[PDB]
Ligand binder design. Structure first.
Ligand SMILES: Cc1cc2nc3c(=O)[nH]c(=O)nc-3n(C[C@H](O)[C@H](O)[C@H](O)COP(=O)(O)O)c2cc1C
Ligand SMILES: Cc1cc2nc3c(=O)[nH]c(=O)nc-3n(C[C@H](O)[C@H](O)[C@H](O)COP(=O)(O)O)c2cc1C
Ligand SMILES: O=C(O)c1ccc(CCc2c(C(=O)O)[nH]c(=O)[nH]c2=O)cc1
Ligand SMILES: O=C(O)c1ccc(CCc2c(C(=O)O)[nH]c(=O)[nH]c2=O)cc1
Lengths: 313, 313
């Protein structure tokens, strides 16, 4: 059996890719993801200028998952654009570029430059709504008027199909409001659910200490902690955005976990913490595992079960 | 070495108690919690009228935690008021009564009648703000104007010290706003962080099905999934509300997990999922485990380490 699929006018060998931020910051990292058996790759979220990010330690992993406050360390937009425009081998797999400007104007400036490269090479845009804390106002995707502005301005500046990386929501009225915003924008063709579960706190009992330096130890959670949160957001948006694709991200360690994301509605499945921990060999294992669960069930395609999670009565 | 605490004008043998909703709905449950080694108990969140709650299955547990959409099944306010006024033996341990009216008026009506019993018998109010108000609006504690209204009205109607049960928040801006609202109300003497992580989705791979019947399988998450989120909220509020107590709730299965809560700032420590799963014998184990960590570290009292989590530089 093979796991090959088409979307967004691209062909993918399988639905797996890295999550933005993991194994994708340097040319080395991008070449390593390209060499992997993933179906696609996404670059590190970038800003107009390079950033060193926050002080170390800024990432830690544990049996149940990870916590991070990286601070958007990246080599700057010119680097990632050059990678997309000159260095990436599109014959190997599709590329998505993640942008995370600190204002609307910065995002507009980047997407205007990306548009012709998207037209000529087929690089895909993932717009990351998460950002550093600004005292006195919420994260963009938790401020629905700010979100609507970002999407209206990016849509106008870019003019081509793109996606948006969302933080998790926890309230059905928030799902309803966020999806209504997203559905105002026909160029938003995919929604990736989810970014890390914001501002957790991991404490080491022995040392009586937080485990990351920035933000007094507060950082985004990934991994096993967040799988049911991720599945709920994937499904909520799959149900609310029938003209869009949903990409699942959060808590994938196994083909089974990927299977659940796809049942919930995921088209592509992104792997963050488990990729950081296991390395790019994980992609062959996830493919093998997903194909085994399909075989056991009699499914020959992903479309035969995508979004088909069953409810009770 | 000593687990005693003396707060809110009561004395507690140890900081452990059930989380509202677990082992606290019937007189049988309340007598069981009173018989246990817990330092306190809290009754099931109640409404003016008795409620049957949602259809079953509405709770499920797994290795990493639980999901529920119970729908506020309870025996009605009058039952819990009678338990507090006439049945509970206050010589065993202190009692908290949790109230979760479906409108501000409902809460005002209950607290008016609870007041004289609170004054005479010393039952302590926990007001649940992580609950529905109007369908299509967020839960109360996610709607800061509604939250302010509920607290103004309850403070005026009740007129005695009380506490509040908060959902988890995920954005620093929400910690900031939420704590600022709470600090407007001097009668709010304790803040219990956290209720369940809202609207997750657990899917069973073999059956391809959600595991709870209400809300298309969406429900609040408890247990191992939510410990870092719980710690973050306990510490966030600990830092922002220096004139209030913080009670920790979420992901406690062991004396080590309780130790982390207390380092974060917790006074009382509540136990939901793990208590549901293990039963009331858990309290002896948690006591023993916490005392063993204290002994190893040379801590004689809880106040020697409460709130003393270390940050890095
Ligand atoms: C070290 C690290 C860096 C990340 N950087 C980004 C990023 O630059 N942009 C982004 O959209 N998400 C970023 N994330 C979030 C992940 O893409 C992903 O949404 C999250 O980790 C949840 O997936 P997981 O459970 O597989 O880890 C980062 C995650 C980690 C652990
Ligand atoms: C079956 C069930 C019933 C619950 N009912 C209530 C409730 O009536 N009021 C309330 O404040 N919280 C309720 N909760 C939330 C718990 O009090 C607790 O905040 C949550 O489960 C997190 O703690 P844990 O990780 O120890 O489970 C309920 C939890 C469960 C599992
Ligand atoms: O708190 C910060 O300093 C902060 C928070 C989020 C971001 C956006 C980039 C990002 C990061 C990161 O670079 O810290 N980590 C994630 O889990 N998700 C992300 O989207 C960037 C910075
Ligand atoms: O979705 C609902 O119908 C809903 C959500 C929350 C409540 C309040 C009672 C409650 C419940 C409950 O009875 O479902 N479960 C929790 O995990 N925490 C709670 O505070 C009650 C009902």
């Amino acid at each position: 059996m093979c796991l090959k699929l088409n979307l967004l006018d691209h062909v993918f060998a399988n639905p797996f890719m890295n999550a933005a931020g993991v194994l994708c910051s340097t040319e080395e990292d991008l070449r390593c993801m390209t060499a992997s058996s993933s179906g696609a790759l996404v670059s590190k979220s970038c800003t107009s200028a390079p950033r060193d990010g926050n002080p170390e330690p800024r990432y830690m992993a544990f049996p149940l998952g990870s916590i991070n406050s990286m601070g958007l360390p990246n080599l700057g937009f010119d680097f990632y654009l050059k990678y997309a425009s000159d260095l990436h081998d599109y014959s190997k797999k599709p590329l998505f570029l993640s942008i995370s400007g600190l204002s609307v104007e910065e995002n507009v400036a980047m997407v205007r430059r990306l548009a012709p490269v998207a037209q000529e090479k087929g690089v895909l845009l993932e717009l990351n709504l998460s950002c550093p804390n600004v005292p006195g106002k919420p994260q963009v995707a938790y401020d629905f008027e700010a979100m609507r502005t970002y999407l209206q301005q990016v849509s106008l500046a870019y003019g081509l199909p793109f996606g948006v990386k969302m933080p998790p929501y926890f309230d059905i009225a928030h799902f309803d409001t966020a999806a209504a915003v997203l559905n105002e924008f026909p160029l938003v063709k995919f929604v990736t659910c989810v970014n890390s579960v914001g501002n957790g706190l991991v404490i080491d009992a022995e040392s009586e200490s937080v485990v990351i330096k920035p933000k007094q130890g507060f950082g985004g959670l990934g991994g096993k902690y967040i799988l049911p949160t991720a599945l709920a957001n994937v499904n909520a948006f799959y149900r609310r955005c029938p003209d869009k694709l949903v990409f699942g991200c959060g808590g994938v360690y196994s083909g089974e976990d990927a299977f659940l994301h796809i049942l919930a509605g995921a088209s592509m499945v992104q792997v963050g913490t488990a990729l950081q921990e296991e390395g790019p060999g994980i992609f062959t294992r996830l493919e093998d595992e997903l194909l085994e669960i399909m075989a056991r069930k009699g499914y020959r395609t992903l479309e035969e079960f995508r979004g088909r999670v069953k409810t009770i009565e």
